Amino acid sequence: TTVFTRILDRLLDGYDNRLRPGLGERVTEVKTDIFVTSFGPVSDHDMEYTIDVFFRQSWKDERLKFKGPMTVLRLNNLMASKIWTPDTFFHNGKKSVAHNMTMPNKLLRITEDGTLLYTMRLTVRAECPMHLEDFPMDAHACPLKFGSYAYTRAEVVYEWTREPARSVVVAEDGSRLNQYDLLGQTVDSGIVQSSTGEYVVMTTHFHLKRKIGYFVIQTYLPCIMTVILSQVSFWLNRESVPARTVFGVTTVLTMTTLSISARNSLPKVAYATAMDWFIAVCYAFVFSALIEFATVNYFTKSQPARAAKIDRLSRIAFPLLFGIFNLVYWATYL
Amino acid sequence: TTVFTRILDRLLDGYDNRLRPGLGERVTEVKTDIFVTSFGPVSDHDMEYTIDVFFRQSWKDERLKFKGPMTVLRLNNLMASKIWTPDTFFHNGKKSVAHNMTMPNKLLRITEDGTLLYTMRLTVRAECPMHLEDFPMDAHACPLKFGSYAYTRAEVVYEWTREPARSVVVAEDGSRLNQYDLLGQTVDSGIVQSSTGEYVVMTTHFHLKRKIGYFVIQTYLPCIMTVILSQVSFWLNRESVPARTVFGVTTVLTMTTLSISARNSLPKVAYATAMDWFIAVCYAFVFSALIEFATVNYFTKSQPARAAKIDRLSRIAFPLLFGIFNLVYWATYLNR
Amino acid sequence: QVQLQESGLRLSCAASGHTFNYPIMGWFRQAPGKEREFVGAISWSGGSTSYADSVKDRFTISRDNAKNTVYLEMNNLKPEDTAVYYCAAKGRYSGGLYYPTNYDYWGQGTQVT
Amino acid sequence: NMSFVKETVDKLLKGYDIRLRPDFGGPPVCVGMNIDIASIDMVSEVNMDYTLTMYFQQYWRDKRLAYSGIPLNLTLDNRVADQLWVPDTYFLNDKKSFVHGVTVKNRMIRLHPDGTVLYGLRITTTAACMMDLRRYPLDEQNCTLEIESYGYTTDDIEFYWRGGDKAVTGVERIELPQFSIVEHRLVSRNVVFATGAYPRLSLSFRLKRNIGYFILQTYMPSILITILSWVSFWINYDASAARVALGITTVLTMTTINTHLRETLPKIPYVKAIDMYLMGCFVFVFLALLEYAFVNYIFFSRAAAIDRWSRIVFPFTFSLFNLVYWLYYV
Amino acid sequence: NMSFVKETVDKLLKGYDIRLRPDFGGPPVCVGMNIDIASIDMVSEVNMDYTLTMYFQQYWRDKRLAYSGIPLNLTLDNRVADQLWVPDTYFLNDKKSFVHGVTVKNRMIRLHPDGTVLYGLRITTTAACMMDLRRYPLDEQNCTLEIESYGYTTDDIEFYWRGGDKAVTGVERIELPQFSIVEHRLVSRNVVFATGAYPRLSLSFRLKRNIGYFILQTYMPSILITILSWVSFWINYDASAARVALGITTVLTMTTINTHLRETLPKIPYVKAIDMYLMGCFVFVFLALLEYAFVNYIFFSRAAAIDRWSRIVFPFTFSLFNLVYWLYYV
Amino acid sequence: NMSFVKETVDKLLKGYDIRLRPDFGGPPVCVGMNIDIASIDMVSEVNMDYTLTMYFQQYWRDKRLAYSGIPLNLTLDNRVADQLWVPDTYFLNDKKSFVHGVTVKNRMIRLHPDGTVLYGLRITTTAACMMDLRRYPLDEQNCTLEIESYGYTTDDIEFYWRGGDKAVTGVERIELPQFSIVEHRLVSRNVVFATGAYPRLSLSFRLKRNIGYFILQTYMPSILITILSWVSFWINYDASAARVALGITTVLTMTTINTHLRETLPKIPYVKAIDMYLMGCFVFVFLALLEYAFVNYIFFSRAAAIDRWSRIVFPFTFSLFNLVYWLYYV
Ligand SMILES: *[C@@H]1O[C@H](CO)[C@@H](O[C@@H]2O[C@H](CO)[C@@H](O[C@@H]3O[C@H](CO[C@H]4O[C@H](CO)[C@@H](O)[C@H](O)[C@@H]4O)[C@@H](O)[C@H](O[C@H]4O[C@H](CO)[C@@H](O)[C@H](O)[C@@H]4O)[C@@H]3O)[C@H](O)[C@H]2NC(C)=O)[C@H](O)[C@H]1NC(C)=O
Ligand SMILES: *[C@@H]1O[C@H](CO)[C@@H](O[C@@H]2O[C@H](CO)[C@@H](O[C@@H]3O[C@H](CO[C@H]4O[C@H](CO)[C@@H](O)[C@H](O)[C@@H]4O)[C@@H](O)[C@H](O[C@H]4O[C@H](CO)[C@@H](O)[C@H](O)[C@@H]4O)[C@@H]3O)[C@H](O)[C@H]2NC(C)=O)[C@H](O)[C@H]1NC(C)=O
Ligand SMILES: *[C@@H]1O[C@H](CO)[C@@H](O[C@@H]2O[C@H](CO)[C@@H](O[C@@H]3O[C@H](CO[C@H]4O[C@H](CO)[C@@H](O)[C@H](O)[C@@H]4O)[C@@H](O)[C@H](O)[C@@H]3O)[C@H](O)[C@H]2NC(C)=O)[C@H](O)[C@H]1NC(C)=O
Ligand SMILES: *[C@@H]1O[C@H](CO)[C@@H](O[C@@H]2O[C@H](CO)[C@@H](O)[C@H](O)[C@H]2NC(C)=O)[C@H](O)[C@H]1NC(C)=O
Ligand SMILES: *[C@@H]1O[C@H](CO)[C@@H](O[C@@H]2O[C@H](CO)[C@@H](O)[C@H](O)[C@H]2NC(C)=O)[C@H](O)[C@H]1NC(C)=O
Ligand SMILES: *[C@@H]1O[C@H](CO)[C@@H](O)[C@H](O)[C@H]1NC(C)=O
Ligand SMILES: *[C@H]1O[C@H](CO)[C@@H](O)[C@H](O)[C@H]1NC(C)=O
Ligand SMILES: CCCCCCCC
Ligand SMILES: NCCc1c[nH]cn1
Ligand SMILES: [Zn+2]
């Protein structure tokens, strides 16, 4: 009833939250653990990804030792502001938010031996540097780096609670990924040098692989159909000049509209992607399919023997060339 | 040294920041100044504009006199919360931000004679009511009004620091206007009688004039050459019915695309603009050309003399009509 | 404004006028002794139904927006059901369903026994 | 003396409980409301809400704040609002609201010797109002602002419009780009909840969409493209290339028009009048091309009779459709 | 008369430690919960979330706050909530949320003589529910809100729905233009994390999408264009310009429709039911043009036989495709 | 001994006046600034700004915070910033910005035995960037970050870069998507305002836009369509339907290209270099169609001579246009 109030008062007189545990005696060892409640959407346009986690930290504070009826005091988050806590921050974070649904989503648990668990609910919007040359067949390893902001390696040291592999745990139902597959993660530790000093950094790379079905059914297949249409022009009679002309120019317009359709799916980068090369090759095939008709019509009456030869050679050549292009492309990028 | 701490503590004892300087003796005069660091973009879609300013206010407070080593003492922004300051607001503000990077962006300076200078950096997203009848040839006078919230005319009166025209200074480098030219500003003061009482209101109108070259190159020129293309249809031979038919109908499609883009750009307002009238006239011309071709094709096989006469009259008349319309439109909208 | 008519097992209530402003149609009951009590409620859009505990399964309320009507179907009739039934309409922001005071327009009663 | 006012204010605030409603055991407090509308910025059909800026004043009476010897009305700094009891007013419709906060929090506390307190706030509110867009863009919306007390029931607090119908000001001057405010109405009522009966005020505007822009841009292109689809008929029926090109290009133009008005419509997923009109015109041009399908089938397997029949029927049928549409939606 | 309540409140909060929950060493504290759904503002398929505004009431027992001599319930100011312990509830599937704060923090505290506390909030939450849009727009979604206790395990706190199935009200107020709630459900359970077992309350809604808009705007134009592609069969076999223009312009119109529904419909990057229909229609339109190419090669390089066969096959095959499509997804 | 350090910091902060600066009446305090640029996340031409994430460090001597007997550097909690005097440094060209707050307000204070104070922040800033896009997408942009003291004049404070040219780091680890940082510069100067002369530091970058994307993705389609335009000259003068369809379909394709590179390219309402190229290509296609119309009028109303003249001239004139365009913008 009132014993716990007396204990808490006895803990917070003479306590200085400004000073870390063992300020000039030892290195504060913080044991970290993450439970990824959800792996939010991955944005290629902004080169970022969102992740909602329970960020757990644990450390020993001898100033908070106590003896009482209960082994562990499960105190509310109000106590967290009155004691020292590590100043952990995400190196690659862009705009994270500590959720505040009806209270600060934090919990504090103090054991009699001075041990202290402090867990928090976070939605980290981290930045993922992406190399999109193989788009949409690309695969990424998006990082999550965190460490202390102020305390160097000689003051605060971070560690994984149980194991590097088994620390970061992902909920089975928390996917939240539309166009990616999460191929596990790899956990690591390291040291980052800086102007102020050396700092301990905990790293976790999440391996992501794009799904290709959307692009295959939306962009690639229509382009293949349009170039196949452009190649059926050769079979039409060469005496139907208006028919072949309208067919070719409208095919060029259809390919232009398809390229514009594929425009928005791309992010803005300064290098040609795989789908850019595919679109360019298809557009050039559509170009050639009508330049062929132009030269055939030019030679249709002055050299009628030649025009039939050009038509037959184009009929045998254009499908074969586009076929080898598809084989090379879909073998290289897969 | 500790002398200044003692002075500042001797100022803040018995000082009630809730009360006003001269709460029952005189009127609190606040001399105001504005330094526009950057005149942010004018959003015609939202009918608003952003402006970045150093807003300076100066008043006298006999409760804050001191005789120390320094004639003027320059304090951090923490002191301003412990001192009465005028409750100035922006009447036409939609949402404004007092910048707070590394500290509240405020300065307070106290002179020995009790004169206080309080300055703060603001980004005001004021609303500009716009009449877009002459779009894209329109010009506007976007206002910026400010005054006290609680204190009426009998309590607080605002004034310009040095002179009206010279009390709103726009930085040369900071323009931030893409499609507008700032033709100076006009300042004034007045009284607004609300339900609560009469309040002094200081007003500043910024005169903006829209640039036309973007719309000239992008909407008007393609529409003009599209209708000219429609006019070219009359010069083709009448016997080539499929050529002229494809020409007219696909030119209607092209005009439709250009007009659709033009509507996409302009802001959503429920009346006709100059651009709307131009687009409607061009679309009417494009439709009329195809109707004329239809009549000619109807009369091409029977009494072809009438068809030839119609074609010749169309060639002579339609370009003349479009030229007359263009001259009337431009002389109307550019001589203002 | 909303005009309400009631047609008298099966019963129905037709509504006309500004039906959009008053999307909820409420069915109330009143005996000679007791005051007006809540029988049921139905949304004009979506056809979501709410029931009183006593008539949770015995009575049903359904929606037909083509004719702008709400149908109250009655089953397993008891003599306690002998009462006058009222059709009423509630505004979008008027609180709970169970309180007759919240309902603005009240149709003519229909006595059943 | 100036210090006398300070002592009076300190005496008033000393021993003052902000947590206790005035006359905690007594009758309810009568709070008089007043509004001055500064602007109604947006009326969003896609979000089905509207933004409104207002000077919102509340007058009430507190015997604890009565003073004597100071004839003036003490206009105090807004921070004093923290140390006083203020009513528990809130808006039900607001998706997001805020009090303007630049250079000060835009609040005013004005005390009076009689004890009456005036509390003014500059509030921007994104109020939610449903829109019956079935008759869009020929519709009559009714967007309302609902004012209620969150905590105190009608036994503890009482609301009324100060000044009767003159309580709200500024509706006459505010103009909207796409609507016209035909009428505004003030209503006062009580609403029963499980907790109890709460007071409520309501400010309801009726908005009528101005119709001089959709006709200029939406209906006429479709109508003229349908007219060109009819021009297809008057071309001779042996010119298959010309007629087929005209018909199919008109179909393509109608498809483009439909897609880009979908891009430039409120984009609410349920059917509207303009959708019905556009689909009617699209069906008309589709039938115009299928008519030539009939003609070419019949002639190669009289045909000019069908062309004349189409010439007389299609304009007449479209005129009938237009009359039905413009009578149904008016 | 009024001061006595002041000393009652003062002694209630004298010696009260907010850091300790009621019965800190004793059995778990039971917290009942009610929700009154004001509205569901949005349901975004792009962001896979929905915005919910609600009155969230919590109800528990605190012996430390028991008072005597005042039989009436003390409806205190919202600021009193700063001095009391509260259950520290949260929502697991939240993205972004807030408590409405216009003119007051929209909270309510009501104390009862037996120490019982009724806490109430007005909360807007942008909750996350993942949607299986493989059947879009012929799909049925399930979106849930997951109320949970953060810091207190199942042996420290216990959750339940106050009133049982009647705990959640206001589902009638939910009014989505493009969805209709077919059912709502309440569930109570326990969930185990590494730190312990916690109580969980799930409020789930099943939503059925209305397909009038989709049928009007996406399905029918793609069917009319396919019919216009069929019209090419009846025209001729020697009128190459007309037939070729018709077929290729139909292909262009289908591509335009696909692009301008891609860039206007919600952007979810994977396959959907509408995509299958659109690609099937595109395949039919493409095969009509290939049919004419085959006919032209046969004739210039029996043609009427192929035309008749295509006439009695293409409508039949498309009707078969529609029958397969409209039975698989319904 | 933490008790010794506790009493040391307690006596340090006891009597510390946050209102007064170091040497309030003495000479100005020197503040040395270091920056470590984590990333330049965004560069928008529509909004004329760029996002910049940075570790901003300030170093200044404070006699009031000198301590003895503790050889180590005292790294205190970030909350100690509330009790200490820190310089009031603001970014003049800032629009929207913040200090990161993930699990803590990302601040660091490090004291030294001799009174030196290191104050570090993690700041994200959407700084204004006035871009001259007349040469877009072949432009170079110089936009900077301008750090200034708000309240303290040069008589009160002095700014300098620590390490000189090495004060700012991380520029060469930045990988922008479509930009390339060519050079960066650091400047220090006094700026005279009406109130007084203040110290300013300027961190300027020069950005070069990568061109491979644009030449592939914007220019090339409109060059190849212009090349399609010239096929009209090689067909025939008698073949009217084919040549008219080719010309007008080229015109329509150019129109669609322009109207969609509109919505995909950023919104900058003034003429740019890409607009001139697109207008030139459109004019070339229009002139080719006029050339055919002139030929048709001459023949039906020498034609081969004009066709050959166009064949020779149009590619040559287009190549000359390309040469003058690329020489004027490179
Ligand atoms: C836009 O949309 C809104 C919302 O639908 C409409 O407003 C409603 O507004 C009308 C006013 O036109 C309100 O009508 C009135 O309610 C007042 C308060 O109500 C009582 O309710 C019942 C009545 O049985 C009782 O519990 C108790 O008496 C309450 O006091 C009444 O006082 C009004 O009375 C006037 O009219 C009646 C009938 O003619 C007379 O008998 C009275 O003497 C008096 O003259 C009136 O009945 C209605 O309540 C509002 N409903 C809501 C908000 O849900 C707008 O009208 C509409 N149009 C606009 C804004 O132009
Ligand atoms: C991006 O674009 C900006 C804007 O155009 C460029 O900014 C200017 O940069 C130049 C240097 O590149 C600056 O010039 C330098 O200013 C220094 C400080 O000047 C003030 O203080 C001195 C006294 O200390 C006064 O005398 C002076 O009047 C100013 O009040 C000077 O010390 C520098 O002098 C050195 O260089 C010059 C020229 O080589 C020599 O003649 C001198 O002897 C001396 O060696 C120099 O003048 C200029 O002030 C900046 N202006 C602004 C507004 O910022 C960026 O350089 C550019 N960056 C990139 C990467 O493109
Ligand atoms: C939307 O999807 C949700 C998840 O798929 C659906 O919720 C599931 O709903 C069912 C039906 O209501 C629940 O089944 C009940 O659970 C209760 C309580 O369960 C727990 O406690 C018992 C105690 O012994 C324990 O044995 C269980 O294992 C649970 O730990 C049971 O008493 C019932 O018999 C029944 O099993 C599911 O629990 C619930 N799961 C989740 C994860 O929410 C929801 O119904 C869907 N929406 C709609 C409208 O249908
Ligand atoms: C607040 O106090 C009142 C008594 O002053 C409680 O009154 C109840 O009265 C209603 C009236 O019919 C009954 O339905 C309830 O059952 C009564 N309460 C109980 C516990 O039986 C009222 O319940 C109190 N408020 C709350 C929220 O319990
Ligand atoms: C305390 O702070 C001082 C000052 O920064 C540290 O001494 C500097 O340390 C760096 C790196 O070790 C050296 O390059 C400098 O020469 C040192 N002196 C100065 C004046 O900068 C010192 O290491 C810190 N730690 C302790 C225990 O004193
Ligand atoms: C602004 O920052 C100061 C400290 O720099 C802080 O005291 C104040 O509360 C902040 N205000 C807001 C509105 O963030
Ligand atoms: C939650 O955090 C915010 C800061 O974002 C703070 O203002 C507030 O007091 C905290 N507590 C609650 C209950 O919101
Ligand atoms: C772009 C390829 C054209 C091929 C022409 C063939 C000439 C014999
Ligand atoms: N003012 C709304 C109080 C309430 C709503 N629901 C239950 N209680
Ligand atoms: Zn388009």
**Do B233 and B316 have their domain in common?**
yes
Residue of E nearest to D125 (CA): E102
- The answer to whether the beta carbons of residues F155 and F143 sit under 8 Å apart is no
Beta bridge partners of residue D184, listed in sequence order? D205
To the question of whether residue E90 is assigned a binding role by annotation, the answer is: yes
Q: Which of D30, D144, D21 is nearest to D91 (CA)?
A: D144
Sign of the CA dihedral D298, D300, D305, D311?
positive
Kind and range of the H or E element at B171? none
Separation CA B18–CA B84 (nearest Å): 7
AA identity, residue B303: Q
Tell me the backbone φ, ψ of residue A12, rounded to 5 degrees. -105, 25
Q: What angle do CA A166, A167, A168 make, to 5 degrees?
A: 100
**Do B240 and B94 have their domain in common?**
no
The beta-carbon neighbor of D150 closest among E108, E225, E234 is E108
Partner B, chain F 103-132, Cβ-Cβ below 8 Å? 121, 123, 125, 128, 130
Residues 6 or more apart in contact with residue E215 via CB below 8 angstroms: none
Establish whether residue B81 lines the binding site of ligand 6, counting it when its CB lies within 6 angstroms of any ligand atom. no
Dihedral in degrees, nearest 10, Cα atoms A49, A54, A60, A61: 100
Q: Which of F309, F292, F318 is nearest to F235 (CA)?
A: F292
Separation CA C14–CA B336 (nearest Å): 61
Q: Which of D156, A102, D60, D88 is nearest to E73 (CA)?
A: D156
AA identity, residue E127: A
Beta bridge partners of residue D232, listed in sequence order? none
Specify the CATH number of the domain E212-328: 1.20.58.390
**Do B248 and B196 have their domain in common?**
no
Query: Of the candidates B211, B241, B259, which is a domain's last residue?
Result: B211
Angle between helices D273-300 and D220-234 (to 10 degrees): 10
Q: What angle do CA F130, F131, F136 make, to 5 degrees?
A: 170
In the reported structure, the alpha carbon of residue A295 is separated from the centroid of ligand 8 by a whole-number distance in angstroms of: 7
Tell me the backbone φ, ψ of residue E296, rounded to 5 degrees. -65, -40
Q: Assign domain F2-209 one CATH number from 2.70.170.10, 3.10.20.740, 3.40.50.620, 2.40.50.140.
A: 2.70.170.10
DSSP for A183-224, written as a single string: EEEEEEEEEE--SS--EEEEEEEEEEEE--HHHIIIIIHHHH
**Do A158 and A264 have their domain in common?**
no
Q: CB distance B250–F248 less than 8 Å?
A: yes
DSSP for E95-124, written as a single string: EEEEE--SSS-SEEEEE-TTSEEEEEEEEE
Separation CA A237–CA A248 (nearest Å): 14
Number of domains in chain C: 1
Q: Which two tokens stand for residue B46?
A: 């939202």
**Do B137 and B67 have their domain in common?**
yes
Could you list the beta-strand ranges (E) of chain E.
29-44, 49-61, 74-76, 89-91, 94-99, 107-111, 116-128, 140-149, 157-161, 168-169, 179-192, 197-209
Specify the CATH number of the domain E3-209: 2.70.170.10
Separation CA B208–CA F49 (nearest Å): 22
Separation CA B192–CA B158 (nearest Å): 13
Q: E209-230: buried (b, 16+ CB within 10 Å) or exposed (e) per residue?
A: bbbebbebbbbebbebbbbbbb
Residue B114: count other Cβ atoms within 10 Å of its Cβ: 16
Dihedral in degrees, nearest 10, Cα atoms B130, B135, B139, B142: 20
Separation CA D11–CA D215 (nearest Å): 67
Strands across the sheet containing E89-91: E89-91, E140-149, E197-209, E179-192
Q: What is the CA radius of gyration of chain E?
A: 31
Separation CA D286–CA E250 (nearest Å): 12
Residue A92: count other Cβ atoms within 10 Å of its Cβ: 19
Q: Which two tokens stand for residue A213?
A: 């079905």
Separation CA D221–CA D229 (nearest Å): 12
Residue B6: count other Cβ atoms within 10 Å of its Cβ: 11
Separation CA B47–CA B94 (nearest Å): 11
Q: CB distance A218–E90 less than 8 Å?
A: no
The residue behind tokens 């730190």 is: E195
Residue D244: count other Cβ atoms within 10 Å of its Cβ: 28
Separation CA C92–CA C20 (nearest Å): 9
Beta bridge partners of residue B124, listed in sequence order? B51, B96
Q: How far is A72 from chain E (nearest CA, A)?
A: 11
Q: How far is B99 from chain F (nearest CA, A)?
A: 9
Partner E, chain C 25-44, Cβ-Cβ below 8 Å? 41, 43
State the CATH number of the domain containing residue A106.
Answer: 2.70.170.10
Q: Which two tokens stand for residue F93?
A: 């060209």
Angle between helices B221-232 and B241-265 (to 10 degrees): 170
Partner A, chain E 252-291, Cβ-Cβ below 8 Å? 252, 255-256, 258-259, 262-263, 268-271, 275, 279, 282, 286, 289-290
**Do B18 and B158 have their domain in common?**
yes
Q: B170-206: buried (b, 16+ CB within 10 Å) or exposed (e) per residue?
A: beeebebbbbbebeebebebeeeeeebbebbbbbbbb
Side-chain half-sphere CA neighbours of A180 within 13 A: 23
Sign of the CA dihedral A34, A40, A42, A45?
negative
- Chains near D, with 3+ CB pairs < 8 A? B, C, E
The residue behind tokens 């609670």 is: A161
Between the alpha carbon of residue D230 and those of residues B163, D218, D224, D233, D248, the distances in Å are: 70, 19, 10, 6, 12
Residue of D nearest to B16 (CA): D6
To the question of whether residue E238 is assigned a binding role by annotation, the answer is: no
State the CATH number of the domain containing residue A278.
Answer: 1.20.58.390
DSSP label at C45? T
SS3 content of chain C, % helix, strand, coil (to 5): 5, 50, 45
Beta bridge partners of residue B95, listed in sequence order? B125
Q: Which two tokens stand for residue F138?
A: 């072949």
DSSP label at F114? T
Is residue C60 less than 8 Å (CB to CB) from chain D? Answer: no
Domain ranges of chain D: 2-209, 214-328
**Do A173 and A50 have their domain in common?**
yes
Establish whether residue B104 lines the binding site of ligand 6, counting it when its CB lies within 6 angstroms of any ligand atom. yes
Could you tell me the residue range of the domain that residue A260 belongs to?
214-332
Q: Which two tokens stand for residue A210?
A: 């794009």
Number of domains in chain A: 2
Q: CB distance A149–F122 less than 8 Å?
A: yes
Kind and range of the H or E element at D35? strand D29-39
Kind and range of the H or E element at C65? none
Q: Assign domain D214-328 one CATH number from 3.40.47.10, 1.20.58.390, 3.30.450.20, 3.60.20.40.
A: 1.20.58.390
Angle between helices B221-232 and F240-264 (to 10 degrees): 170
DSSP for E201-214, written as a single string: EEEEEEEEE--HHH
Separation CA E219–CA E106 (nearest Å): 46
Burial class (CB in 10 A: 0-12, 13-18, 19+), A21: buried
Residues 6 or more apart in contact with residue E95 via CB below 8 angstroms: A123, E47, E49, E126, E127, E128
Could you list the beta-strand ranges (E) of chain B.
28-38, 42-43, 48-60, 72-75, 88-90, 93-98, 106-111, 115-127, 139-148, 156-160, 168-170, 180-193, 198-210
AA identity, residue B138: D
**Do A266 and A128 have their domain in common?**
no
Provide the total of helices (H) and of strands (E) in chain B, helices listed first. Answer: 7, 13
Sign of the CA dihedral D71, D77, D80, D82?
positive
- The answer to whether the beta carbons of residues A178 and A38 sit under 8 Å apart is no
Chain centroid to CA B228: 36
DSSP label at A93? B
- The answer to whether the beta carbons of residues A181 and A206 sit under 8 Å apart is no
Q: Which two tokens stand for residue E102?
A: 């216009």
Query: Of the candidates B176, B211, B246, which is a domain's last residue?
Result: B211
Separation CA E316–CA E312 (nearest Å): 7
- The answer to whether the beta carbons of residues D130 and E175 sit under 8 Å apart is yes
In the reported structure, the alpha carbon of residue F202 is separated from the centroid of ligand 2 by a whole-number distance in angstroms of: 10
Side-chain half-sphere CA neighbours of A260 within 13 A: 27
- The answer to whether the beta carbons of residues F72 and A55 sit under 8 Å apart is no
Q: Are strands E140-149 and F74-76 parallel, antiparallel or unpaired?
A: unpaired
Q: Which two tokens stand for residue E113?
A: 């003589």
Separation CA E143–CA A134 (nearest Å): 36
Find the largest Cα–Cα distance for chain F.
108
Which residues of F fall within a CB distance of 8 Å from A87?
77-78, 103-104, 106, 108
- The answer to whether the beta carbons of residues D94 and E100 sit under 8 Å apart is yes
Beta bridge partners of residue B146, listed in sequence order? B90, B202
Separation CA E15–CA D330 (nearest Å): 70
Query: Of the candidates A210, A239, A263, which is a domain's last residue?
Result: A210
Beta bridge partners of residue A169, listed in sequence order? A35
Separation CA A45–CA A35 (nearest Å): 27
Side-chain half-sphere CA neighbours of B76 within 13 A: 18
**Do A170 and A229 have their domain in common?**
no
- The answer to whether the beta carbons of residues B90 and B123 sit under 8 Å apart is no
Angle between helices D240-263 and D273-300 (to 10 degrees): 170
Chain centroid to CA A302: 61
Burial class (CB in 10 A: 0-12, 13-18, 19+), D70: middle
Between the alpha carbon of residue D142 and those of residues C21, C43, D43, E178, F70, the distances in Å are: 8, 19, 11, 21, 72
Coil, strand or helix at E59: strand
Coil, strand or helix at C33: coil
Q: D123-148: buried (b, 16+ CB within 10 Å) or exposed (e) per residue?
A: bbbbbbbbbebeebbebebbbbbbbb
Residue nearest to atom 9 of ligand 6 (CA): B104
Experimental structure resolution, Å:
2.8
Q: CB distance F275–B217 less than 8 Å?
A: yes
